[PDB]
Write a protein that binds this DNA or RNA. Structure first.
Ligand SMILES: [Zn+2]
Lengths: 125, 118, 62, 135, 339, 246, 62
RNA sequence: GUCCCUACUGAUGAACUCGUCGCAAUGGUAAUUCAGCUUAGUACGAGAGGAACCGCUGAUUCAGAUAAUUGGUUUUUGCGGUUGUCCGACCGGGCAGUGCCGCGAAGCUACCAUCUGCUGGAUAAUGGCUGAACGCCUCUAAGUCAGAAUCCAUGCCAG
């Protein structure tokens, strides 16, 4: 089993959640909620709607160029089973998880580092 | 193929065969087939092992990658370079000015409330 | 189709009950009984051994 | 032999009797018109309906004039009404579409335009052969 | 509708009664039949199906399951019945020492204004060397009775409910001599019994309940006995990883994100049972064993779980844990303002 | 060696099976009769795997590959890939591809040397097939039928094509493939050769409705059952063919 | 299942034959009829399908 | 060209000190049909063709529940957009018997969603065993075995 990502919003689409739409040319869209489904059907741009990770990636609200993110990718070449290999892999999963959280904290902070100066200037005014 | 022997159902010492094993171990909707019996692995005891699939909202099969330890060590090395660089170093009159601004806003809200009152 | 109350269907169900489900339920009953048993062990008149009286009608009052 | 498929699981039926359908094969018909459903159960005033992989009897309403106004068996490959697959996935297609099929289960055409339902591909081996996209 | 359930009428009691215990023979080991629990809600699971001959064999199937919070039951009594030409007759009953405040509230109607004087003379009987009388009643059950039941009550104080009044019922002991079962009950006095001990994983059981009222003639509040429901899991509450499987290594409880809607959090032993169950959330449930040996392969199947849904039930939710939500989300204005 | 079998009661073998020079894939369902026929004809000489693709039994029409590799559609899940990898030796490269035309067994026909593909596959997919299979990939339609995977069965010893292929098309295809081709039928007049048959260099498994003349043609074309079977048998003993398929 | 007091054997004097003996004529005869009735052909041609278990000889042990 | 009485059926209810746990007279009664896999291309058959019992998996109808999921309904007038007119303008709003539109929780719903539907005895036709009538014979006369979705009960609902 896999965790899918919503086409419209990118939130983790877990099993038995949302509707999939199949069009005739051969592509499938997995939607995680009725909101995303209805918005896609009424043809709004996810890149324009401000509540979508696609919009965030377009507007540079998210960390998008980083090795701890390059560590994850869709696999198309199966690898033979190895117990130690998933064990060290799971320890990795934890390591990468905490690293991603801590890098994202720093990215958010270096985005809005300058707020106090503006607030104090407005208060002086 | 050339060194092979024809299967014949009347032969006494045939091959065991899946029909015979399922008929011996049950029927058609009763026999349960073990799909890992033909699994050729490095260690033969690693069969019948339960595969991890999800670890806190992320996919083990998507994060699974041969030769990942070198990439991991490179990752902690980059982390080391980063804190030593300082990527992670956290950095009264203004407080009273802000307090006075908040008091002025409260007074303006009271004035607006009185204006809507009358 | 044969009814749920058919004699042959009942005979088949009896055979199934005697051959497979019987043993399976007996094994589970043994396990649960062992667990509950472990959880449990986790003069006549003035002793109670002689059962005496505590503290409309069937016969016509004489 | 009645063209009632065996082993078909429960799914929502969204194409009732008298239903207009797109035609997905290269047979010369563009639309079909469901008039009857194989394997249906006649209830009080209940309209029979069929889901993906169920044989129906359809009449062509537009297409090649030689085949126009003719009645053939068909099996439906695409359903816009959402339904759930046993992996818990509710899904639907863009339109309603089927293919003309003989009572044994062989297609008159040679190709299928667009995707084919997984249920139909599993039930009818010929459609699995004439299918290019399976979803 | 069905003339079996008609004339349709409200259930005379809120608890719901068993009305039939399984037939008893001495050969089987000594065991209890039924249990109690409180419906918490429903969640979604997936199962590595191992049903031979099915279209979904060796595949993953999404099924809906119900959660019943099952705090341990306390044994407070032992009832002895006899056979008569008019039927079964409750010959005697024997109570224990130290009846709980919740079962005393069950006995009382206006507990707050009452002087709580219940079972005080029975306690004096036990403690003041009228153990002769207690043993006399016990031996009467030993030698005159044929079927023996145990009085048991739940822990409302452990179930997260505004109520404080416990539910008492008789659970029949099967599989043994009357002497063995009376000794078993007397040993079970003043002890908690566990749902993992009364039932186990992979066991089709019977659920007895009262249907949801559909009023504001009678629609609903109807006593039903639904049969053949496969218990899929028994969770320990203190395991801290009840919702975890061997396929996903997520340390999470059965309680969804934000808690069960209109019920709360399940912090006790719980039972995860396939399918739908009569009754609304927080309603009392009765769990008993099948009256007959089963006739289906579905009964002998072994349920291999893969994952358990812990997403929010209060709306279209999509995160199993708050940790997952904060990892997907990052940091917020409130978090930086607080920090 | 030509044999006759049915999946459950269906004559379509190529829909439920995929046979190559190094492995065999069998659809998993109910009994073990299909797997038993395949193993009794391949007594552990090459691995045989009970597999499902996209949760279906049409693995034969959904999988394409040769002795050197195997390709699966993007819909196939990671557990199915793990099963395939664990059942198949390392000398076989398995890859999952994001083709718009998911029916790989219907759009690709590949022996150990050449592959014929639907003309509408993507460029990335074309050279990824050329990479994984290590063969020469050509785009062509047979008998004006665009589904070569369902309308042709190919091996390293021969190839059976649609019964209504022209002589010009047939000899052109023979020139490109490099093996002899004969237009013949399978399962009593059925035109879906690929969907009704799996064949390799030393085994063919057709349906139970396949008639004796066309079975003999199949054996001759694929040079099976030892004997001679060059196709010269087909040319020489033409009386049976002209009498039966007149 | 036989009535109590009935001995059943597959004697190695002739092939495809069984001997059912005992003390009670009623029990022995009822058992023989029980096997004969349980091996009955259904929905077939009586003139064509000649399979079953039939009583061939009747007598005394001594 | 002439609103009452009673029946059905819930829901209440005085008298037995209140309350808790139970028994079960009596009344009602529920499941139905089809298909697929194996048997088996087997028995049978010149050929064409072609089963059944055991086992297994589904589906129709009927019945009883249920809301994880997925659709639908909005007086939540919840959030957002918008027309006429008005509060001197903005914000904020009133009126148009809920102005219209988009999304919309909770509730409720839907074979538009999902779960569950269970076992003993006596028999009818009929097939018998032993055996008289009637020195043959006979399933019946005395005695007795089996057997239908039938009947009576359990399971189930009421008390
Ligand atoms: Zn969404």
């Amino acid at each position: 089993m896999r965790i899918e990502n919503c086409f419209f919003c990118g939130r983790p689409a877990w099993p038995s959640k949302g509707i999939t739409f199949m069009r005739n040319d051969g592509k499938a869209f997995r939607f995680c909620r009725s909101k995303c489904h209805k918005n896609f059907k009424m043809k709004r741009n996810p890149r324009k709607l401000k509540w979508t990770k696609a919009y965030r990636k377009n507007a540079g609200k998210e960390m998008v160029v980083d090795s701890t993110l390059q560590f994850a990718a869709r696999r198309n070449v199966p690898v033979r089973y190895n117990r130690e290999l998933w064990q060290k892999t799971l320890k990795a999963m934890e390591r990468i998880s905490e690293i991603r959280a801590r890098r994202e904290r720093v990215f958010y902070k270096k985005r809005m580092a300058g707020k106090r100066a503006r607030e104090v200037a407005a208060a002086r005014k | 193929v050339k060194n092979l022997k024809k299967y014949d159902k009347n032969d006494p010492n045939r091959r065991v065969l899946a029909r015979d094993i399922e008929e011996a171990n049950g029927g058609a909707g009763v026999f349960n087939v073990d799909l890992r019996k033909d699994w050729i692995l490095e260690n033969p005891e690693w069969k019948y092992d339960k595969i991890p699939e999800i670890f806190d909202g992320k996919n083990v099969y998507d994060y699974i990658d041969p030769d990942i330890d070198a990439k991991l060590q490179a990752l902690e090395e980059e982390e080391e370079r980063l804190e030593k660089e300082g990527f992670y170093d956290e950095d009264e009159e203004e407080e009273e000015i802000l307090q006075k601004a908040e008091y002025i806003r409260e007074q303006h809200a009271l004035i607006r409330n009185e204006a809507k009152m009358r | 189709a044969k009814s749920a109350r058919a004699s042959r269907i009942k005979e088949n169900h009896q055979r199934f009950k005697k051959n497979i489900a019987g043993p399976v339920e007996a094994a589970r009953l043994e396990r649960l009984s062992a667990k509950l048993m472990a959880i449990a062990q986790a003069s006549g008149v003035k002793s109670g051994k002689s059962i005496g009286r505590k503290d409309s009608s069937i016969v016509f009052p004489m | 032999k009645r063209g009632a498929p065996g082993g078909k699981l429960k799914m929502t039926l969204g194409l009732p009797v008298g239903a207009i359908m797109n035609c997905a094969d290269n047979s010369g018909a563009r639309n079909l018109y469901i008039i009857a459903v194989k394997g249906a159960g006649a209830r009080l005033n209940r309209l029979p309906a069929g889901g993906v992989g169920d044989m129906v009897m359809a009449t062509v309403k537009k297409g090649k004039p030689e085949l126009r106004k003719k009645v053939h068996p068909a099996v439906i490959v695409r359903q816009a009404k959402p339904w759930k697959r046993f992996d818990g996935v509710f899904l639907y297609f863009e339109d309603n579409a089927g293919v003309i099929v003989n009572p044994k289960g062989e297609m008159k055409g040679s190709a299928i335009t667009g995707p084919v339902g997984k249920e139909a591909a599993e039930l009818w081996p010929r459609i699995a052969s004439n299918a290019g996209v399976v979803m | 509708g069905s003339l079996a359930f008609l004339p349709r009428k409200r259930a005379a009691r809120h608890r719901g009664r068993v009305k039939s215990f399984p037939k008893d023979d001495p050969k089987k080991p000594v065991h209890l039949t039924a249990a109690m629990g409180y419906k918490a809600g429903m969640t979604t699971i997936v199962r590595d199906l191992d049903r031979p001959g099915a279209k979904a064999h060796k595949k993953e199937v999404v099924e809906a399951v119900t959660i019943i919070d099952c705090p341990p039951m306390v044994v407070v009594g032992l009832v002895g019945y006899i056979e008569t030409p008019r039927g079964l007759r409750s010959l005697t009953t024997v109570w224990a020492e130290h009846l709980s405040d919740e079962v005393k509230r069950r006995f009382y109607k206006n507990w707050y204004k009452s002087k709580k004087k219940a079972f005080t003379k029975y306690a004096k009987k036990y403690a003041e060397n009228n153990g002769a009388s207690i043993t006399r009643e016990l031996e009467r059950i030993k030698k005159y009775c044929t079927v023996v039941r145990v009085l048991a009550h739940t822990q409302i104080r452990k179930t997260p409910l505004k109520q404080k009044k416990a539910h008492l019922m008789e659970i029949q002991i099967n599989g043994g001599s009357v002497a063995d079962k009376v000794e078993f009950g007397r040993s079970l006095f003043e002890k908690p019994v566990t749902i993992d001990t009364i039932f186990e994983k992979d066991e089709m059981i019977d659920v007895i309940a009262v249907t949801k009222g559909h009023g504001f003639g009678q629609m609903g509040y109807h006593h039903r006995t639904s049969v053949n429901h496969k218990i899929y899991r028994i969770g320990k509450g203190d395991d801290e990883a009840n919702a975890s499987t061997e396929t996903d290594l997520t340390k999470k409880k059965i309680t969804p994100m934000g808690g069960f809607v209109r019920y709360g959090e399940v912090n006790n032993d719980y039972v995860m049972i396939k399918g739908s169950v009569p009754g609304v959330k927080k309603r009392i449930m009765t769990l008993r064993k099948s009256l007959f040996t089963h006739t289906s392969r579905k009964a002998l199947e072994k349920v291999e779980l893969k994952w358990i849904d812990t997403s929010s039930e209060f709306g279209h939710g999509a995160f199993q844990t708050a940790a997952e939500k904060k990892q997907f989300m990052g940091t917020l204005k409130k978090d930086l303002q607080t920090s | 060696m030509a044999v006759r079998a049915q999946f459950e009661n269906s004559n379509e073998v190529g829909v439920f099976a995929t046979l190559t020079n190094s492995y065999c894939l069998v659809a998993l369902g109910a009994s073990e009769n299909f797997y038993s026929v395949f193993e009794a004809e391949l007594q552990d000489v090459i691995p045989i795997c009970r597999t499902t693709i996209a949760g279906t039994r049409i693995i034969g029409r959904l999988t394409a590959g040769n002795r050197k590799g195997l390709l699966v559609p993007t819909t196939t899940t990671d557990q199915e890939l793990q099963h395939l990898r664990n059942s198949l030796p390392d000398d076989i490269r398995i890859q999952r591809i994001e083709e718009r035309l998911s029916a790989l067994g219907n759009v690709i026909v590949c022996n150990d040397h050449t592959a014929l593909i639907h003309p509408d596959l993507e460029r990335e997919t074309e050279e990824i097939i050329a990479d994984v299979l290590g063969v020469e990939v050509f785009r062509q339609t047979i008998a004006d039928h665009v589904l070569v995977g369902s309308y042709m069965a190919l091996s390293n010893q021969g190839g059976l094509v649609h019964p209504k292929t022209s002589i010009q098309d047939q000899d052109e295809l023979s020139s490109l493939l490099g093996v002899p081709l004969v237009a013949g039928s399978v399962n009593r007049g059925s035109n879906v050769i690929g969907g009704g048959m799996v064949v390799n260099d030393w085994l063919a498994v057709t349906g139970l409705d396949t008639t004796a003349p066309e079975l003999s043609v199949i054996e001759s074309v694929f040079r099976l059952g030892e004997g001679a079977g060059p196709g010269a048998i087909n040319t020489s003993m033409k009386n049976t063919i002209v009498e039966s398929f007149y | 299942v036989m009535a109590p007091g009935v001995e059943v054997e597959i004697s190695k004097a002739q092939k495809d034959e069984l001997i059912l003996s005992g003390n009670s004529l009623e029990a022995v005869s009822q058992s023989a009829a029980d096997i004969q009735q349980i091996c009955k052909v259904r929905n077939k041609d009586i003139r064509k399908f000649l399979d079953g278990i039939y009583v061939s000889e009747k007598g005394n042990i001594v």
